[PDB]
Amino acid sequence: AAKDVKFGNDARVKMLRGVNVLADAVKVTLGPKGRNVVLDKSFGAPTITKDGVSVAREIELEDKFENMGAQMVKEVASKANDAAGDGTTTATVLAQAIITEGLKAVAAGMNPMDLKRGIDKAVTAAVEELKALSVPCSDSKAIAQVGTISANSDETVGKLIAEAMDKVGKEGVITVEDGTGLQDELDVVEGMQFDRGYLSPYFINKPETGAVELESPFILLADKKISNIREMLPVLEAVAKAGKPLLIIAEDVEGEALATLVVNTMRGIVKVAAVKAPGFGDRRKAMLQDIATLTGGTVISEEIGMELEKATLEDLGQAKRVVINKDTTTIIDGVGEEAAIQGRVAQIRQQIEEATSDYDREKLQERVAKLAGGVAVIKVGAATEVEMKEKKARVEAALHATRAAVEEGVVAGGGVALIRVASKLADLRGQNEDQNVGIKVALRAMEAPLRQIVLNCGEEPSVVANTVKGGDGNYGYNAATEEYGNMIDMGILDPTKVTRSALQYAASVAGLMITTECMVTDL
Amino acid sequence: AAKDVKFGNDARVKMLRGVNVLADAVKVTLGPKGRNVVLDKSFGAPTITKDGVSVAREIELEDKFENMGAQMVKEVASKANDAAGDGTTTATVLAQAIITEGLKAVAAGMNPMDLKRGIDKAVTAAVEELKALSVPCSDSKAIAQVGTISANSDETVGKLIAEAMDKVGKEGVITVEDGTGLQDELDVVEGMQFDRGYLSPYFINKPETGAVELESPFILLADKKISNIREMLPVLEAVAKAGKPLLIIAEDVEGEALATLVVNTMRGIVKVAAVKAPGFGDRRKAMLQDIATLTGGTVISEEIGMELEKATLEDLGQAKRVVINKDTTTIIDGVGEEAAIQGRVAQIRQQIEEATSDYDREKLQERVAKLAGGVAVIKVGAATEVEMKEKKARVEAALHATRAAVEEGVVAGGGVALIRVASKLADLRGQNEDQNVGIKVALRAMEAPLRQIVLNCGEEPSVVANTVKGGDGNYGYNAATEEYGNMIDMGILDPTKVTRSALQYAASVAGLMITTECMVTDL
Amino acid sequence: AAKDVKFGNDARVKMLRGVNVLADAVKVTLGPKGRNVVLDKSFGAPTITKDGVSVAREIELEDKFENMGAQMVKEVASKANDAAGDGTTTATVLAQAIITEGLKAVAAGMNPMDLKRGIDKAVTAAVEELKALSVPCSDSKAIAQVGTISANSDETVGKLIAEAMDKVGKEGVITVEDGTGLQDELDVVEGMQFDRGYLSPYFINKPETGAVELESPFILLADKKISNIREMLPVLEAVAKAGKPLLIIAEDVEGEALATLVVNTMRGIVKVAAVKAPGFGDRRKAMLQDIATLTGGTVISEEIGMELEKATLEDLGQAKRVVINKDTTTIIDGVGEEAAIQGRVAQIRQQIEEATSDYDREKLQERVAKLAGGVAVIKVGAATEVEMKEKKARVEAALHATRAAVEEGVVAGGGVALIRVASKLADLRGQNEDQNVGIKVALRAMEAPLRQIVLNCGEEPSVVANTVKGGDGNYGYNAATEEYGNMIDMGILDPTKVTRSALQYAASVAGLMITTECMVTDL
Numbered sequence A, B, C: 001a002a003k004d005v006k007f008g009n010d011a012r013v014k015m016l017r018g019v020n021v022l023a024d025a026v027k028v029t030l031g032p033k034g035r036n037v038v039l040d041k042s043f044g045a046p047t048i049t050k051d052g053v054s055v056a057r058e059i060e061l062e063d064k065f066e067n068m069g070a071q072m073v074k075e076v077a078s079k080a081n082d083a084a085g086d087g088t089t090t091a092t093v094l095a096q097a098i099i100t101e102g103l104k105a106v107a108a109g110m111n112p113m114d115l116k117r118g119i120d121k122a123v124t125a126a127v128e129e130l131k132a133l134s135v136p137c138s139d140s141k142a143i144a145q146v147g148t149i150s151a152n153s154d155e156t157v158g159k160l161i162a163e164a165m166d167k168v169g170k171e172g173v174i175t176v177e178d179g180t181g182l183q184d185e186l187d188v189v190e191g192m193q194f195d196r197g198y199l200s201p202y203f204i205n206k207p208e209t210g211a212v213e214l215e216s217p218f219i220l221l222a223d224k225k226i227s228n229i230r231e232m233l234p235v236l237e238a239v240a241k242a243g244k245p246l247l248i249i250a251e252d253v254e255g256e257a258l259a260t261l262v263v264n265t266m267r268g269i270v271k272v273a274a275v276k277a278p279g280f281g282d283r284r285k286a287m288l289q290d291i292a293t294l295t296g297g298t299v300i301s302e303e304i305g306m307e308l309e310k311a312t313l314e315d316l317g318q319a320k321r322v323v324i325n326k327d328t329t330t331i332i333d334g335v336g337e338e339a340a341i342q343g344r345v346a347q348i349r350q351q352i353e354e355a356t357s358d359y360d361r362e363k364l365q366e367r368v369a370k371l372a373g374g375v376a377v378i379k380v381g382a383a384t385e386v387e388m389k390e391k392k393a394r395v396e397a398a399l400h401a402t403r404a405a406v407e408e409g410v411v412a413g414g415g416v417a418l419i420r421v422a423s424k425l426a427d428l429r430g431q432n433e434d435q436n437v438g439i440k441v442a443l444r445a446m447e448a449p450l451r452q453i454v455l456n457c458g459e460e461p462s463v464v465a466n467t468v469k470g471g472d473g474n475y476g477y478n479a480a481t482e483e484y485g486n487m488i489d490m491g492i493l494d495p496t497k498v499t500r501s502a503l504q505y506a507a508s509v510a511g512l513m514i515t516t517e518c519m520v521t522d523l
């Protein structure tokens, strides 16, 4: 229809305003100081949102332009959020600062391209500085602190993460489940996880994560790849009597032949999942055997000459629940046999010793390791179910961040790294003045989030920022202490990766936002 | 219903205004200096457009008249864009200048017909001058520069094009694929391409290009033409078990008999493609054999007495993907057998040597050449998928332009050719004054785009244009240098063809636009 | 519902205004001087119309009354246009002048009936004068000029017509086809045309012309008339395998029996055409044989005892395309056999010589003549497809006009005949004064179109008209020359028929329009 066209700033302004609104809520929330926001819902009782991301998620802008601008930030932020596990807000905060300055520059009329380049250049420099700055992750006490940061002053989460982490081991994977009751429960789980993808996203379950969880899944394992439906079918027929959800393990399915027929021909209404059998070769078979024992189901192979058709439901094992993600597919708990599982482990363990070769040992050890498979399950209790879900989500985020953080190693929190890097960054100059300003802008952007925390403190961020900058080495302000001390000594460290991730995304967002000469919209 | 009728200028004005709006955005963008524009979308997050064409594409005018006028320019521009591969903006820019002047002339009330004729005459003269002006394409370094022009200061694209071009060879075809990852990958592809059309546009796939790509296509080759469905059918039945998309190679299908029955009788729901077998006669058979080996499928011929019905899926080969365009049909990668492919090539190669005759040698050599078939595949990485798509499109455009440019040979860029020609053109007179003015107008139009670049520079285009005109030979202004130097020496050259194409189209557009005595529209 | 009633002038005025609007656009366009008009379209990009008819066609009036009035003129004009092939505008121009005067007379309140009678009387007189005035058509150079007139200064069309005409021969029919490419191609076609009607308009194809064109038609010839479906059916069954469109040649079909069953019983969805076999008696058979040879199909006759059912598709010939019009049915190109066709021609030719009788000779010669059948095909190229269509239409119109013109013979163009006749006409008096005025009006009307051309010239038509009238013999003004010279000598001649046709229609229109005492419309 008729279009309303605006040029120049008009495009920017809408985005800017939208960004600010979203940013403002997020910024306040960010930092242990800040607090959450509330949203209405037509669907049901209104939703109250905490966590910076959630607040942003909740916030929608009536104005299309503003909303769209807001959306852009959010999407980037989420992406950073996923990878970092934390720092969603930080990216948002950074982006807002960058955008505003960039917009002003746009007002300046300096070509934004240089600025973007300068910003990117600055970002790269900052990243390098950060990496150098980053140091190894500290001990569990630090870990708890790391957890707390993700916690946003959720002491329990950090404690839980640390506790879970300790028992499982940092390396060991920890899984989160909804709490049985208000009190959290930490249980080591009997079961194994193997890294296998889901064949198709179609398989991917309802939840947003896209990990598929099956309730009481049935496990059919074929050492042989499941070439075609027909072999499968007689298994399926038993499955019809079944209907507890079916998980299928096959060495491989050729996508075209199976998928084409299956998808088009077959509705595939019945719940099914497919995963490639872990490992390859004998090891794969061995892994299958291990899985089979754990499942308590049996595996059918051509070599055995057992027929899939022949195999009944009984052959198929059952799992209490299975979760699958693209990276990995896990079975939370195969029913298994306690004796059987143990026996297999011992047998494998014996094998590990038996094999002279390291390689043989490794495969066996890996196999046993999986079978022993101490997976941590963490239950989060809550006063209410809703709370539990909220808590659980937070916990999960924290866990990821913590795990990443430990490996990456700690960097000073409080945006100390950001401020510190900026000073170094400032010296660096862009190719051209326009770039230079952008570079400066980026530096300014980095500084801001420190200020925000200070603002939450109510201390004047200027002094703090100045002081922070002045201090060499790792210098920072601890909100809780409200005292100056080494970040490391304080033990409050934000993950390198999260910081880096957020910054990069934020920078990207800002750059993208800046360059629009013109907008068109409908009237 | 009731009509709102306007006479004379009223018709023109709407078009003119519409043209200007579209043109303005395009003009600024054009040239390495310029920048892109943004568009909203109801469908999803708003679309931000760069590249002159895209900006134009994005821009829609609320006013029907204006929009229509804008559309007219765009359509012509695109046509020029396709052929030239570049210069979409240039044509638009040229058109706008011409149109405005023509409109003014219309205001003058001079009969536009003469003007159009004069313009056409001028265009022809200019074209001739350009052709003479044009010189052979320069080396790869120039090529990169050529690439950059298409790049619109996309250094990477030019580099990629040059790099791809070098390895493949200029003559060798280069294909672009989406990047696997952010980093670009250049891989020579194993596979052959043969120039065959698609039997029907119906076959033509979803994408706008209309080239059809099949995922994991199955290749059925019959040396014999596939007369009727019935012979095909048993192949199809196997195909039913199949469903990875089927590509059919047949010597010929008589359109009426097969098509009539097939289309009407048969939904043709299942994905299928048909291509004529390459070559004719023994050579065709030989080509088929080469294809068959590459595919790894087998070919069935009456002479063999193999039956299509008899032939199973296995006989049909598979391709990783196939792309078909009207001009040519290619298989990106037949699974083939590495040994088999090599062996065939050697055998053919031996044949080439064996044949005394040049003709025999040529056919064989062509066959081997296809089999060796170093096709370049270029993967474009991107920060985001969206970016990659955008980049890829740009890359593709650049590649076409570069290829065309090299063969055509370089002409001075910067609209140097255009300005230069105009001066010569000016001397030429139209038959009548009205024609004369039109001729002058065309000349003026040519000059303008040089100015636009200058304007982007911010230098006063008048001086530059004057200076450029003054210089004899190839004289031009390099935006980047902002120094006067030989265009050739500078090595920044716009393709002759692109320039010529754009000019002709623009002229055509302008002429068309000019002549409307009256408009009618609904109220 | 409620009606808005107007009496007297109110009815007229709407029509008059509508007429003027349509007329004005047309008048300007008419004459080589004039230019075309543009129209919008919701459907797609707006349609730009040239050619007087098209402009009129495009122009629609919002007002119902005006529109209706406009429509009336157009419809008559088109009718004249078809017959004349040219002079669509002229009729319109004439009508407008007549109508206005008549309306004024209506204002006068003189009974329009007399005026109409007077006008008719004047027209008749004028016609007689014109006929006497008309002279034989001139040579090809004139023909080109004739072509140009239809051309409306389309030099190419005239040239093409002349060129086509020369090769084909004036007598020989010329057919127009869309150009293969921009360059026109003139090819003599191998094929025969026979004058046969289409049995039913139902058969009549989609296009407005109503001529039916079949793509790759199949030709079934029965010497015997195709009495019933049943005999046909087995042919049809083969046809089902077919589906390239089927053309049927039968001696006769009794309408009721076949049609009733066929239409009602049978959807007749499958494309089919029926034509009566050319000629009757042995000659008809002979013609069929000639057709059959040309088609390459075979004919089945009862005498032969061949069965239609028995006859397969193979027996049926195929044609590249067939065009059928009510007057005649032609096959553009039967596949035929080159040798076969030639042989038949020779055989017939021998027969022609062989037959002593003129009658026998004539039939044979006609048969051979058809087989030799040099039909001219003219391809019109265009810059764009749209242009080509437009050009083609113009070309076709020109061809008809030219052919008619040549036979009729030339009359002075420029409305010279019209002006000349009027003077003579003026002397003639109507029965009564009211008639007299009408007669004068008609005379005035004739004069006007000369003026319009002059107006386009910008010369004052009064002087020209006066001068033209003054000159005895053929005196006229040549727009291009802008010099006075003999029309014949100038060689610019408008066809007698076209002029006569247009005048008569215009007069009819004017008369019809004039007499409405009252109008009623809805509110």
Ligand SMILES: Nc1ncnc2c1ncn2[C@@H]1O[C@H](COP(=O)(O)OP(=O)(O)OP(=O)(O)O)[C@@H](O)[C@H]1O
Pocket (backbone or CB within 6 Å): A029, A030, A031, A032, A051, A052, A053, A081, A086, A087, A088, A089, A090, A091, A149, A150, A152, A412, A413, A414, A415, A453, A477, A478, A479, A480, A481, A492, A493, A494
């Ligand atoms: N006591 C503290 N002293 C200094 N800064 C602190 C302290 N506790 C936390 N912070 C800082 O506050 C930020 C963590 O808060 P938060 O997790 O809300 O930010 P975020 O991760 O960007 O937002 P979200 O978690 O909603 O994505 C980090 O920069 C962290 O170092």
Ligand SMILES: Nc1ncnc2c1ncn2[C@@H]1O[C@H](COP(=O)(O)OP(=O)(O)OP(=O)(O)O)[C@@H](O)[C@H]1O
Pocket (backbone or CB within 6 Å): B029, B030, B031, B032, B051, B052, B053, B081, B086, B087, B088, B089, B090, B091, B149, B150, B152, B412, B413, B414, B415, B453, B477, B478, B479, B480, B481, B492, B493, B494
């Ligand atoms: N350094 C330079 N000096 C002079 N002119 C330059 C320079 N770099 C590019 N140009 C000119 O700018 C134009 C190329 O820009 P662009 O590709 O945007 O124009 P376009 O092809 O008409 O637009 P589009 O590519 O959007 O169709 C050419 O005329 C080219 O010669």
Ligand SMILES: Nc1ncnc2c1ncn2[C@@H]1O[C@H](COP(=O)(O)OP(=O)(O)OP(=O)(O)O)[C@@H](O)[C@H]1O
Pocket (backbone or CB within 6 Å): C029, C030, C031, C032, C051, C052, C053, C081, C086, C087, C088, C089, C090, C091, C149, C150, C152, C412, C413, C414, C415, C453, C477, C478, C479, C480, C481, C492, C493, C494
């Ligand atoms: N050089 C000329 N000198 C005099 N009159 C001319 C000349 N060329 C063409 N004409 C006249 O102009 C008229 C032909 O133009 P045109 O074909 O547009 O009129 P039309 O046939 O009535 O309109 P249309 O072709 O749209 O129906 C004729 O009367 C013809 O004699």
Ligand SMILES: [Mg+2]
Pocket (backbone or CB within 6 Å): A086, A087, A088, A089, A149, A150, A152
């Ligand atoms: Mg956080």
Ligand SMILES: [Mg+2]
Pocket (backbone or CB within 6 Å): B086, B087, B088, B089, B149, B150, B152
């Ligand atoms: Mg370009």
Ligand SMILES: [Mg+2]
Pocket (backbone or CB within 6 Å): C086, C087, C088, C089, C149, C150, C152
């Ligand atoms: Mg005409």
